[PDB]
Structure 1
Amino acid sequence: MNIIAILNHMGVYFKEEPIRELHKALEALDFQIVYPNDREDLLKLIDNNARLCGVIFDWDTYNLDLCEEISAMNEHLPVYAFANTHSTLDVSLNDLRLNVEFFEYALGAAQDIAQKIRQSTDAYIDEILPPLTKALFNYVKEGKYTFCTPGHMGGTAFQKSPVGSIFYDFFGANAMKSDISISVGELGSLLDHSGPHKEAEEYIARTFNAERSYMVTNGTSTANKIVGMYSAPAGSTVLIDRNCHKSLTHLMMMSDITPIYFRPTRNAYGILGGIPKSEFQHDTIAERVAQTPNATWPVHAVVTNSTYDGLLYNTDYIKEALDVKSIHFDSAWVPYTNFSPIYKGLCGMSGGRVEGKVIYETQSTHKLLAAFSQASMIHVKGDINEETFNEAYMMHTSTSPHYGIVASTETAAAMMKGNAGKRLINGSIERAIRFRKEIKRLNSESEGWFFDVWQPEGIDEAKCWPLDSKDNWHGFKDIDNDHMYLDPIKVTLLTPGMQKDGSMADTGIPASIVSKYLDEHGIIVEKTGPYNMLFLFSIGIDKTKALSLLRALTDFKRSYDLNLRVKNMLPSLYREDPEFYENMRIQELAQGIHALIQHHNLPDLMYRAFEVLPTMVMNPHAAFQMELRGQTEEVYLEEMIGKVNANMILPYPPGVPLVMPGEMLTEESRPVLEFLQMLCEIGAHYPGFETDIHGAYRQDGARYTVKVIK
């Protein structure tokens, strides 16, 4: 952050010679000088380069409205205006609001002006940096000797070893030097919420519209565990979204709590819909409590918002209708909701505090914002026992937190702020919408089949698109109005193979093949269903990557229409089993997998399996205790009925948990088992295309076994 732009090159020596002297003086202070040709050049340079730290221009040539244009992009960016004919009589109050510093043309004054610019640059950096990150950077500059943990002593131990020196050279000196512990009292303590850590927490809470915020260095899995254990004492009843991350299941195995499940919807593609508005009603919950052994009125509820596929709830209705004093939105997929008006009312922190309730949001800062893996945020709005919550927090936080992860959390919060952050979020949303429109246009232009995007017909402006009962693009039967919305950021592409009425088609291209092709050409997709692919158009996606994705998709279409050999299109798949893929073309593999899916009736079987709920003989805690005591055995899928499952069965082709520990299948829940059996067969017909049944163990002979209670 050392680039200074100097705008003009005038015709008078008394201005240019001081400017040349200042350029030399700034180069002596380790600044890189750039020379935009005109105002538009300068604006584009600021727009494309976040490392610009100052702008120098002639006030006679350009009015202070140029400073307003600069401020609209970055209101903190320092601008240095050189005054010759303008006086103090020529500045208005609004002009004085801008971050402009005035100088004069004089020979021999370059040193002092360069010093002033250096100080202004330091002030700008200090202003945009968040407090904990700034403290960490300063301490690293201090360079003290440590006889304390961590043992590498700021990277010395790495430098004393050959392989260690390779590691040190890869990760850099600063990363090693910033790996410190609480022995450094100047930075405070994460566990004690002291010093710069406390200010970082307050900074994050202010930025994310939370009454209070907590930094978690073991991911939203740990954040969910902290919130759930604070909110759900042993022997209590909890409402759980059946579309829940496995961390909630880990929490249920942690302590004796009786769950009652919200029932979500799904479409023909297996895209997970939202929970219907009825499930949040008092009567439904009371009936489920009555019909569930050892169940009382729930004291805590957990809802996944948004879904993996980008479906956001109307959270105001959930807050008003759900008669439980503790509501927790697992918002791991949407940490950006506070930073765009399109998400208003669609997130847990939206609005003010709810009377008689506490609201939690768990956010994965690493997933959709810019932070290191395992960085996570807990946001609280409402009354909590802060001391008790602190002990719940300490029970899952390491005594030696990774300071880089913590700093990355704070820095993501800081990036979210100001005109620059607003531009980043808005640009990501606009880029995603432009890509969606382009996919639609290409689909219209294609003579034959082309990729389609799962979205409403006439999307024009940036907003979350409601899912309406009249519109059938979403594929959800009898959906409630003003309930679910589509996040523009989560782009779902659809391959051919499904009809508009929810039925399958004669020909189709499984999305796994497209995913493998994209991976071969350097594009990693987030998630691949049977006929859908998910692309996260986050703030890390730029125009280059979007155009690259369009090129790769059209390249796949051209290669597929050319009936290329598998050995050519998919070298890695061929390397999996050269004998199997020796000669058959890509169309043949696509049609074979499509025919397997159709004959096994994957969509209908999946929908029926996830429509019915297996009976709960015992809660997950009891099942895990039985497994720990050894009272379990391994049986094949054939003997699933009548046996209580010990492990969460999580089929990955659907991707959502299907069986919970303590649940068993019966005659009514027979379809579930059937679907599972189907998966096994699908895994035994195409190497490289292996079905994943988490919680089941792949035994020799192309079969699966599951642990059940003895």
Structure 2
Amino acid sequence: VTNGTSTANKIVVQALTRPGDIVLIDRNCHKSHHYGLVLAGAYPMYLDAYPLPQYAIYGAVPLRTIKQALLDLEAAGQLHRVRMLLLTNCTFDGVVYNPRRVMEEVLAIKPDICFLWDEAWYAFATAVPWARQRTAMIAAERLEQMLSTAEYAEEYRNWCASMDGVDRSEWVDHRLLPDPNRARVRVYATHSTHKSLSALRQASMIHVRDQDFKALTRDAFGEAFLTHTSTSPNQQLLASLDLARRQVDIEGFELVRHVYNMALVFRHRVRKDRLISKWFRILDESDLVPDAFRSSTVQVRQGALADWNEAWRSDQFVLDPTRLTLFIGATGMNGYDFREKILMERFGIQINKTSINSVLLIFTIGVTWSSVHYLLDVLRRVAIDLDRSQKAASGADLALHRRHVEEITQDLPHLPDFSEFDLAFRPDDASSFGDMRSAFYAGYEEADREYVQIGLAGRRLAEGKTLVSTTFVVPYPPGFPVLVPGQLVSKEIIYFLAQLDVKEIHGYNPDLGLSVFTQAALARMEAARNAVATVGAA
């Protein structure tokens, strides 16, 4: 695909989904994903990541949640609709999903679902040993091999005997194995081939591993590929290019490996340097993955080959070695300020994300031993000056410093979990998926929209006149849509929104208000939906 990664997602989504399907999409995923779901009419069921309040960031979505949501739709009898599980193989923070488990257990419930993995962030997995396993195409290969073996058929027989007499509603409490006969591995993935940012930022690939592609989806996939990218004489790229055993890049193997050994050297120095480690720390699976999701329990940098391998094989969540979250909370300085002033000169490492008390270091092919040594120099200078100003501290300066540390460490604000869709837009009132497309288009009716000040919105909730957002809201710090068309603005989301002083939030403006539905418009839309749900059923 000669266009940016979001075009590959558009292609596969349009090739697999039809309007009125349910797509289980993680809410943390970038706004471009949700906009694509608005297109094609798909109804998203939002899956909510486990929170990390102490960093005010989100992790992955536990497989527990994915199973529970699928089972919940199964109890509603709606499950037949479910056509996709859109996840991101590597989270922006770095949390790497273990795909083989996320697909075994999901295919236990829905034997014919399609998986889409956005792997744009998991770029260097081919350098890191034991990382390629957690990709979508290697997970799909291993799962397809497993499903073919007779030994697996015996394992599944014994597993069914183990679950025999367990109520299907209780499947969330037990691991699941995908029935070999019904389970159909239909995995997809998308990434960027080292695309140049700002200019010619078009590099992308669609990796397809789909047993039914040739029968059910070849035509739709080709048509979507032409629709998204304009038809041209050079149509070879869409149909029959099949470059699975092509585009060998031995030099690119040496470049990804140079960048991985660069990340290793940085991560080692930042820990062993006695100045830096006094104030700085790099977060680890012990810090960024709650231990409920890591069966393995009690040096990784030195050696660690064949001991820490198990964590990659069996854990739910691990850190990508190149997505280094630098904790700065002990510096008593907020991430936005630290990035803005200390790191203003910038360098090959992107440092493109800033949480309240941490900054995310993203190594890229533009790295060298001099970018590593520059960043380490910067860190060491900050450490030296913090030591100086700590030694100069009076008791009042000690109170100042310690509270500057406390305010970014102890009482951090609650992370707004997804509120359920408004009734006017849930097609089935028993289930939490929503007609987010119709809420998107219904939001442009300038007579149905209304503006309410954030301060007013809490009062309105107390009054009982429910608030429903007409539009996406995508604040910069989390970098994903906290609100979507037709989502109820629950009290916690109002309280979260109220703290942000950035006027420039996407989809919202504090000088103007929340773009919410008028009450009469909501009543009318609810009545219309109930009329449709009547005429459509009797």
**Aligned AA (2:87):** V
Could you tell me how far 1:655 is from its partner in structure 2? 2.4
Q: Verify: 1:389 aligned to 2:221, yes or no.
A: yes
1:547-562 correspondence runs (5 A)? 547-561=373-387
1:191-590 correspondence runs (5 A)? 215-217=1-3, 219-267=4-52, 268-281=54-67, 284-288=69-73, 290=75, 296-322=80-106, 323=110, 324-338=112-126, 340-351=128-139, 352=141, 354=144, 356-366=184-194, 372-382=200-210, 383-384=212-213, 385-398=217-230, 417-418=249-250, 420-442=251-273, 444-445=274-275, 449-455=278-284, 458-460=299-301, 461=303, 482-497=315-330, 508-523=332-347, 525-561=351-387
Tell me the distance in 2 between the aligned counterparts of 1:465 and 1:279: 26
Tell me the distance in 2 between the aligned counterparts of 1:591 and 1:659: 35
**Aligned AA (2:131):** Y
Contact kept, 8 Å, 2:453 with 2:510, in 1: the verdict is no
Could you tell me how far 1:368 is from its partner in structure 2? 9.6
SS at match of 1:492: strand
Contact kept, 8 Å, 2:329 with 2:358, in 1: the verdict is no
Could you tell me how far 1:484 is from its partner in structure 2? 0.7
**Aligned AA (1:705):** G
SS at match of 1:634: strand
Contact kept, 8 Å, 2:130 with 2:309, in 1: the verdict is no
Aligned residue in 1 for 2:514: 706
Tell me the distance in 2 between the aligned counterparts of 1:616 and 1:332: 32
Could you tell me how far 1:663 is from its partner in structure 2? 0.5
Tell me the distance in 2 between the aligned counterparts of 1:624 and 1:650: 15
Aligned residue in 1 for 2:492: 671
**Aligned AA (1:376):** S
**Aligned AA (1:316):** R
Could you tell me how far 1:538 is from its partner in structure 2? 2.5
Tell me the distance in 1 between the aligned counterparts of 2:483 and 2:96: 25
For residues 10-43 of structure 1, give each alpha carbon's deviation from its aligned partner in whole angstroms, at most 9, with x where no partner exists: xxxxxxxxxxxxxxxxxxxxxxxxxxxxxxxxxx
Tell me the distance in 2 between the aligned counterparts of 1:402 and 1:515: 44
User: Quick check: 455-464 or 237-246, which moved more?
Assistant: 455-464
Tell me the distance in 1 between the aligned counterparts of 2:16 and 2:339: 40
Could you tell me how far 1:508 is from its partner in structure 2? 1.7
Aligned residue in 2 for 1:658: 482
Q: Which runs of 5+ in 1 are unaligned?
A: 1-214, 469-479, 498-506, 565-585, 684-689
Match of 1:613 among 408, 415, 419: 419
**Aligned AA (1:259):** P
Could you tell me how far 1:265 is from its partner in structure 2? 1.2
SS at match of 1:303: strand
Aligned residue in 2 for 1:647: 471
Contact kept, 8 Å, 2:84 with 2:116, in 1: the verdict is yes
Could you tell me how far 1:553 is from its partner in structure 2? 1.7
Tell me the distance in 1 between the aligned counterparts of 2:319 and 2:233: 36
**Aligned AA (1:695):** G
Tell me the distance in 2 between the aligned counterparts of 1:313 and 1:706: 35
SS at match of 2:469: coil
SS at match of 2:121: coil
Could you tell me how far 1:489 is from its partner in structure 2? 1.0
Could you tell me how far 1:361 is from its partner in structure 2? 0.4
Could you tell me how far 1:233 is from its partner in structure 2? 0.4
Could you tell me how far 1:654 is from its partner in structure 2? 2.4
**Aligned AA (1:395):** T
Tell me the distance in 1 between the aligned counterparts of 2:90 and 2:43: 24
For residues 72-112 of structure 1, give each alpha carbon's deviation from its aligned partner in whole angstroms, at most 9, with x where no partner exists: xxxxxxxxxxxxxxxxxxxxxxxxxxxxxxxxxxxxxxxxx
Could you tell me how far 1:436 is from its partner in structure 2? 0.7
CA gap of 1:302–1:371, structure 2 versus 1, over 3 A, is: farther
Contact kept, 8 Å, 2:421 with 2:488, in 1: the verdict is yes
CA gap of 1:596–1:494, structure 2 versus 1, over 3 A, is: closer
CA gap of 1:636–1:544, structure 2 versus 1, over 3 A, is: same
Could you tell me how far 1:251 is from its partner in structure 2? 1.7
Aligned residue in 1 for 2:160: none
CA gap of 1:596–1:222, structure 2 versus 1, over 3 A, is: same
Tell me the distance in 1 between the aligned counterparts of 2:456 and 2:232: 46
Contact kept, 8 Å, 2:473 with 2:481, in 1: the verdict is yes
Could you tell me how far 1:426 is from its partner in structure 2? 2.2
SS at match of 1:349: helix
Could you tell me how far 1:561 is from its partner in structure 2? 4.7
Aligned residue in 2 for 1:629: 445
Structure with bigger RCO (C-alpha 8 Å, 6+ apart): 2
**Aligned AA (2:186):** V
SS at match of 2:484: coil
CA gap of 1:227–1:614, structure 2 versus 1, over 3 A, is: same
Could you tell me how far 1:326 is from its partner in structure 2? 0.7
Contact kept, 8 Å, 2:84 with 2:114, in 1: the verdict is yes
For residues 101-146 of structure 1, give each alpha carbon's deviation from its aligned partner in whole angstroms, at most 9, with x where no partner exists: xxxxxxxxxxxxxxxxxxxxxxxxxxxxxxxxxxxxxxxxxxxxxx
Q: Verify: 1:697 aligned to 2:525, yes or no.
A: no
For residues 174-225 of structure 1, give each alpha carbon's deviation from its aligned partner in whole angstroms, at most 9, with x where no partner exists: xxxxxxxxxxxxxxxxxxxxxxxxxxxxxxxxxxxxxxxxx141x1222212
TM value normalised by structure 2: 0.69
Could you tell me how far 1:371 is from its partner in structure 2? 9.7
TM value normalised by structure 1: 0.53
For residues 582-608 of structure 1, give each alpha carbon's deviation from its aligned partner in whole angstroms, at most 9, with x where no partner exists: xxxx99998897676579x4x2422xx
For residues 285-325 of structure 1, give each alpha carbon's deviation from its aligned partner in whole angstroms, at most 9, with x where no partner exists: 13145469x77441111011100011111111122121242
Contact kept, 8 Å, 1:216 with 1:223, in 2: the verdict is no
The alignment-based identity, stated in percent, is 27
SS at match of 1:534: strand
CA gap of 1:531–1:335, structure 2 versus 1, over 3 A, is: same
For residues 634-662 of structure 1, give each alpha carbon's deviation from its aligned partner in whole angstroms, at most 9, with x where no partner exists: 22223444121111222222223222211
Contact kept, 8 Å, 1:527 with 1:533, in 2: the verdict is yes
Could you tell me how far 1:339 is from its partner in structure 2? 5.3
| Residue correspondences, number | 423
Return the index of the structure with the highest Cα Rg: 1
**Aligned AA (1:309):** D
Could you tell me how far 1:337 is from its partner in structure 2? 3.0
Tell me the distance in 2 between the aligned counterparts of 1:652 and 1:273: 17
Tell me the distance in 2 between the aligned counterparts of 1:514 and 1:260: 37
Contact kept, 8 Å, 1:336 with 1:369, in 2: the verdict is no
Contact kept, 8 Å, 2:26 with 2:46, in 1: the verdict is yes
Match of 1:638 among 455, 459, 466: 455
SS at match of 2:451: strand
Tell me the distance in 1 between the aligned counterparts of 2:342 and 2:246: 34
For residues 352-398 of structure 1, give each alpha carbon's deviation from its aligned partner in whole angstroms, at most 9, with x where no partner exists: 27462311101133469999413222111113222211111222224
1:680-691 correspondence runs (5 A)? 683=501, 690=502
Contact kept, 8 Å, 1:220 with 1:377, in 2: the verdict is yes
Could you tell me how far 1:341 is from its partner in structure 2? 3.9
Tell me the distance in 2 between the aligned counterparts of 1:652 and 1:331: 22
Root mean square deviation, CA, Å = 3.9
**Aligned AA (1:673):** I
**Aligned AA (2:113):** K
**Aligned AA (2:472):** M
Aligned residue in 2 for 1:98: none
SS at match of 1:365: coil
